[PDB]
Design a protein around this ligand. Structure first.
Ligand SMILES: [Ca+2]
Ligand SMILES: [Ca+2]
Ligand SMILES: [Gd]
Length: 185
């Protein structure tokens, strides 16, 4: 139903980007730690514009995740419920059926987190800043970003990041360039 290459890809985003308190289950608590994190890193005025965008955007993502994975409606999402969902999404993308709104919010949230500069491109400096903070070493944020940017001849616009994003979550092709989007496997 789901190859290990995809499973393993799919749990990294869980254990490394969602379970921000490292307790086995995604819940809103994890989203607060993340909000705090990005708030600080990018030095946002604590209740100003970006911080509040980030918080009301992550309320939607939780609510989306909540609604599309929480089988028992217990306000927490286990890896089982997390894989169980992502399988549907893979079918979905493969079978044409596009992703639910909250996915496109998460996807673009990650982009906007990176693109502090505002120019709708992610230069290398922006990529290393974010993903190092997540505890990926710098010999990867630099390693991977060259896989993602093809040496730097390709600008990494919002569209490019979407393609890469997609390949990360659903491509079973263990040679696909987007498989390095969250670092190196
Ligand atoms: Ca649950
Ligand atoms: Ca930029
Ligand atoms: Gd958690």
């Amino acid at each position: 139903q789901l190859s290990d290459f995809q499973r393993n890809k799919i749990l990294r985003v869980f254990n490394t980007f969602y379970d921000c308190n490292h307790d086995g289950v995604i819940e809103w608590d994890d989203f607060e730690l993340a909000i705090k994190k990005i708030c600080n890193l990018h030095s946002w005025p604590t209740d100003g514009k970006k911080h509040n965008e980030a918080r009301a955007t992550l309320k939607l993502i939780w609510d989306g995740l909540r609604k599309y994975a929480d089988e028992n409606e217990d306000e927490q999402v286990t890896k089982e419920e997390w894989l169980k969902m992502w399988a549907e999404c893979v079918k979905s993308v493969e079978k044409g059926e596009s992703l639910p709104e909250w996915l496109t919010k998460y996807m673009n949230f990650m982009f906007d987190v990176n693109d502090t500069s505002g120019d709708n491109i992610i230069d290398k400096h922006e990529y290393s800043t974010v993903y190092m903070s997540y505890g990926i070493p710098k010999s990867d944020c630099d390693a991977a970003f060259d896989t993602l940017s093809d040496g730097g001849k390709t600008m990494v616009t919002r569209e490019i990041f979407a393609r890469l994003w997609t390949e990360y979550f659903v491509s079973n092709d263990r040679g696909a360039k987007g498989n390095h989007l969250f670092g190196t496997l």
